[PDB]
């Protein structure tokens, strides 16, 4: 009924997939950096 409500229906899927792609690059940093061992070495 609202042009902002159907805007809000596309909105949270567009919030959901960016957080789904953001949770893949957190895992990709985990498997390649091994950053905590480099953090202890500094």
């Amino acid at each position: 009924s609202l042009p902002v409500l159907m805007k809000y229906s596309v909105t949270a899927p567009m919030v959901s997939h960016v957080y789904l792609v953001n949770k893949a690059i957190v895992d990709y940093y985990f498997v390649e950096l091994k950053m905590e061992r480099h953090f202890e070495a500094m």
Binding site: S1, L5, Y8, S9, A12, V15, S16
Partner: protein
């Protein structure tokens, strides 16, 4: 909308209040006239189911009953001995 979208009051990313709200919207639209009772009886339904879901939000995330006896104990001084040792020490150097 600021902090997290699954924490909404109506149920908007997380629940299905919205479809019921949309049905209510079609019903309200289908009306050429206006009166007071039909407008305000469904002002309950956009309020009351919304006014209970945030009550069921903040119980679990915070342990509500925890800090809301703690903040009164700091101001109304429920822990009475626990500030008198402060008062005894703070007297000797607020002189």
């Amino acid at each position: 909308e600021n902090q997290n979208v699954n924490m909404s009051r109506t149920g908007s990313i997380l629940k299905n209040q919205e479809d019921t709200f949309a049905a209510e919207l079609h019903r309200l639209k289908q009306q050429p006239l206006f009166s007071l009772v039909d407008f305000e009886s469904v002002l309950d339904r956009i309020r009351s189911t919304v006014a209970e879901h945030l009550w069921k939000l903040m119980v679990e995330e915070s342990d509500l009953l925890g800090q809301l006896k703690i903040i009164k104990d700091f101001y109304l001084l429920g822990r009475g001995e626990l500030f008198q040792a402060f008062i005894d020490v703070a007297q000797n150097m607020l002189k």
